Amino acid sequence: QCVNLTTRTQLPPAYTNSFTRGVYYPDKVFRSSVLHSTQDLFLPFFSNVTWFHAITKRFDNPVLPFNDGVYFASTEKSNIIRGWIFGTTLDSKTQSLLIVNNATNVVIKVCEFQFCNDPFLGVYYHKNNKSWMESEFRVYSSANNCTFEYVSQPFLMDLEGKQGNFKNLREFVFKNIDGYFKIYSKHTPINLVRDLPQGFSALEPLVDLPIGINITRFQTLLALHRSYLTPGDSSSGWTAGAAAYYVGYLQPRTFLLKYNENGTITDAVDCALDPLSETKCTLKSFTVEKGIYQTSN
Amino acid sequence: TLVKQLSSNFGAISSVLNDILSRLDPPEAEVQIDRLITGRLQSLQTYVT
Amino acid sequence: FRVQPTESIVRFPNITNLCPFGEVFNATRFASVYAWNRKRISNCVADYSVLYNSASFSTFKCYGVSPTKLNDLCFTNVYADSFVIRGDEVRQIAPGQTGKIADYNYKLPDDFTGCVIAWNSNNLDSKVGGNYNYLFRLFRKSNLKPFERDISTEIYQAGSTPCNGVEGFNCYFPLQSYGFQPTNGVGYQPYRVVVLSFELLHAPATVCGPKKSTNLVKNKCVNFNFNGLTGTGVLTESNKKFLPFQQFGRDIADTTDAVRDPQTLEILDITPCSFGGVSVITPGTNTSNQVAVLYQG
Amino acid sequence: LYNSASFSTFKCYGVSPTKLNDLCFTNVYADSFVIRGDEVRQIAPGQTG
Numbered sequence: 001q002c003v004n005l006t007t008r009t010q011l012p013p014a015y016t017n018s019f020t021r022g023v024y025y026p027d028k029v030f031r032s033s034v035l036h037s038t039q040d041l042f043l044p045f046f047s048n049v050t051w052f053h054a055i056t057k058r059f060d061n062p063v064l065p066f067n068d069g070v071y072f073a074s075t076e077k078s079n080i081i082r083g084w085i086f087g088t089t090l091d092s093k094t095q096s097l098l099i100v101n102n103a104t105n106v107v108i109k110v111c112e113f114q115f116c117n118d119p120f121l122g123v124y125y126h127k128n129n130k131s132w133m134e135s136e137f138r139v140y141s142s143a144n145n146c147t148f149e150y151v152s153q154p155f156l157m158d159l160e161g162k163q164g165n166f167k168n169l170r171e172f173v174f175k176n177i178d179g180y181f182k183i184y185s186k187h188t189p190i191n192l193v194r195d196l197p198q199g200f201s202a203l204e205p206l207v208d209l210p211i212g213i214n215i216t217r218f219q220t221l222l223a224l225h226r227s228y229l230t231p232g233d234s235s236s237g238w239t240a241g242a243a244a245y246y247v248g249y250l251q252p253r254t255f256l257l258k259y260n261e262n263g264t265i266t267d268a269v270d271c272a273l274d275p276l277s278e279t280k281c282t283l284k285s286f287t288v289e290k291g292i293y294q295t296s297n
Numbered sequence: 298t299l300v301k302q303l304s305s306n307f308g309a310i311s312s313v314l315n316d317i318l319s320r321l322d323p324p325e326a327e328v329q330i331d332r333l334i335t336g337r338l339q340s341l342q343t344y345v346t
Numbered sequence: 347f348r349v350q351p352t353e354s355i356v357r358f359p360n361i362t363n364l365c366p367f368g369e370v371f372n373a374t375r376f377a378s379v380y381a382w383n384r385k386r387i388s389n390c391v392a393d394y395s396v397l398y399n400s401a402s403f404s405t406f407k408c409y410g411v412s413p414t415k416l417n418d419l420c421f422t423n424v425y426a427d428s429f430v431i432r433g434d435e436v437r438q439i440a441p442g443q444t445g446k447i448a449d450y451n452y453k454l455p456d457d458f459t460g461c462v463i464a465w466n467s468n469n470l471d472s473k474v475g476g477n478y479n480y481l482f483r484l485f486r487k488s489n490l491k492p493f494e495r496d497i498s499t500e501i502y503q504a505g506s507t508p509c510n511g512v513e514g515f516n517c518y519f520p521l522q523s524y525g526f527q528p529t530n531g532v533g534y535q536p537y538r539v540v541v542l543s544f545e546l547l548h549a550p551a552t553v554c555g556p557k558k559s560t561n562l563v564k565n566k567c568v569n570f571n572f573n574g575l576t577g578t579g580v581l582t583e584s585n586k587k588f589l590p591f592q593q594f595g596r597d598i599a600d601t602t603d604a605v606r607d608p609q610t611l612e613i614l615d616i617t618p619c620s621f622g623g624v625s626v627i628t629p630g631t632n633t634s635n636q637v638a639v640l641y642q643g
Numbered sequence: 644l645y646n647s648a649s650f651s652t653f654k655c656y657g658v659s660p661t662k663l664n665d666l667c668f669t670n671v672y673a674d675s676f677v678i679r680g681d682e683v684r685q686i687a688p689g690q691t692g
């Protein structure tokens with residue numbers, strides 16, 4: 001069932017900077033007009049995040065690591081990125097998580113899967129009509145056991161292969177603690193072709209699926225566009241599309257958060273970024289006046 | 298500081314007396330209540346001084 | 347001066363499910379101690395009193411909680427671990443007790459909250475020919491962390507001589523069998539052990555005891571019980587904009603001043619009942635015996 | 644003694660040979676004799692013969 005895609009000129013991925021991005025709500029307690037300090041896993045301010053271009057033959061879906069959490073941001077217009085695979089070895093010898101977004105089904109299965117060398121989703125231009133569906137949905141071989149086959153309603157998403165200036169930013173935070181796979185998500189419209197926008201947004205909790213499996217690596221599922229020009233063979237026969245996605249990793253950091261009167265997080269301070277940030281964290285204020293202050297030992 | 302000193306465990310299982318009294322029988326609850334009482338007394342004495 | 351409560355109200359979620367405690371406690375097969383199984387219980391009504399007096403259990407110890415009050419508390423994601431152990435090693439299943447089975451097998455945390463239950467299985471799980479289906483790990487390089495399972499079998503190496511898998515001198519198989527026979531004494535009779543582990547609620551909790559709900563009363567000094575949250579105050583409608591994932595609120599002093607009703611899903615303010623000091627104005631008992639009273643604030 | 648023992652049976656009861664060095668005893672008694680090979684099983688803490 002497996003195929004070996006070829007003709008992919010691998011290049012060293014670019015690196016960009018995350019400016020004040022990746023903050024989420026750390027608990028479900030409602031707060032208002034208060035400055036609260038919390039210690040958790042966050043994406044550090046002004047951090048270096050690698051950049052992947054899914055657009056010669058620069059196509060990349062490598063098996064990235066999963067270190068204490070991952071911040072995932074994607075800027076697209078044609079929904080090229082559908083979902084992610086999580087697991088340890090992806091060799092059907094261990095339970096592997098799966099998340100997919102397709103109209104036919106949204107398999108949120110947690111079953112042993114024999115993942116191929118290049119797990120991918122193939123959206124192909126049919127001849128009878130402009131109908132788009134998976135060409136090789138057999139990314140696995142067989143589910144020996146399914147522990148959490150909690151398939152939700154199949155997400156209805158448009159399928160087409162087009163390229164244009166990006167229109168929306170989808171940001172995600174993945175954590176795996178105490179057998180809970182937590183997801184925080186957001187959606188903000190932006191119109192740029194450059195690196196991550198400079199802005200502050202707080203991600204709201206999405207789901208708290210209790211999969212409880214071991215996760216070490218992860219890979220992104222991408223929609224391969226088989227066209228009439230391409231031969232159609234599962235080695236080089238597909239079209240490019242336009243997409244971009246970024247990866248960052250979470251670390252244990254202490255943050256000072258600001259809640260407005262409506263209860264939304266509007267600003268944050270990373271204490272360990274600078275001595276000025278340590279001074280702000282010690283004084284529990286976002287402004288510091290003239291003087292000399294002792295901050296640590 | 299006196300109001301913020303009301304959220305310290307002082308070695309007990311919790312800083313809320315209602316949680317202690319709703320989860321433990323009296324002979325075992327008194328042991329945690331004593332620690333809470335000691336801590337809060339010390340805080341009050343420091344404020345008065 | 348203190349205003350006294352007039353009544354009491356209790357509000358619990360309307361869940362009709364019954365927790366499947368029957369199947370876990372008495373099933374066909376119980377695993378061996380070195381590889382214990384874990385069953386997760388959620389979204390049901392649990393009646394621990396019937397378990398408290400179902401059968402003559404050998405021991406029923408609860409740590410951090412009292413068995414009589416288990417019926418009035420709400421928990422989240424109750425766990426249940428079952429295994430078969432020797433009679434003499436039951437004392438090492440208590441938290442903080444060092445021993446062979448605690449060091450190299452099932453280990454409880456120091457801050458363990460829950461109940462440990464054991465009973466005698468010599469009437470059924472004692473074969474005259476000998477029960478060798480139950481194993482245990484006798485050699486291990488280091489101490490096990492709390493709530494950790496080991497399923498990897500490798501030849502233990504003692505001394506400078508390397509085993510290299512020959513299983514010869516200074517090399518032993520980590521697993522050792524059991525000799526449960528009816529001819530053995532009471533100390534060697536096998537005992538089945540079930541450990542219930544509770545975690546306190548911060549997310550919404552659905553594992554609650556069978557407590558009937560009462561009607562909600564507002565604008566009166568009343569005692570309330572919201573999913574275990576106990577207190578006294580006046581419940582009033584509030585305009586605070588709780589987000590859908592938020593269940594209660596807090597102030598600067600970190601006191602619960604808002605709550606969401608588990609049944610009707612409405613937001614209620616919590617205000618403590620009126621109180622103050624009392625002062626008595628007197629003109630001197632020599633002059634007269636008439637007094638005036640001032641109520642502070 | 645334990646390392647490169649070349650002994651037919653080096654068995655310690657109630658203690659590990661590797662950890663014998665750390666903890667300190669006093670008045671160690673050394674009893675020696677000669678038995679048959681088939682009688683080795685009889686020399687055990689809890690056997691007979």
Ligand SMILES: *[C@@H]1O[C@H](CO)[C@@H](O)[C@H](O)[C@H]1NC(C)=O
Pocket residue numbers: 088214215216
């Ligand atoms: C998870 O998988 C890794 C392999 O990447 C392994 O080293 C580890 O022991 C496994 N278990 C845990 C609890 O990390």
Ligand SMILES: *[C@@H]1O[C@H](CO)[C@@H](O)[C@H](O)[C@H]1NC(C)=O
Pocket residue numbers: 260261262
């Ligand atoms: C809070 O929400 C109200 C209602 O939309 C809005 O008018 C007000 O500007 C908000 N406050 C902010 C954004 O600080």
Ligand SMILES: *[C@@H]1O[C@H](CO)[C@@H](O)[C@H](O)[C@H]1NC(C)=O
Pocket residue numbers: 368371372400401
């Ligand atoms: C298992 O335990 C339940 C509860 O005590 C009891 O009603 C049931 O009969 C038991 N089943 C067996 C097979 O012993």
Ligand SMILES: *[C@@H]1O[C@H](CO)[C@@H](O)[C@H](O)[C@H]1NC(C)=O
Pocket residue numbers: 360608609610
């Ligand atoms: C049961 O609880 C739900 C909330 O999940 C509520 O909408 C419904 O009205 C309740 N039913 C009754 C009979 O109280």
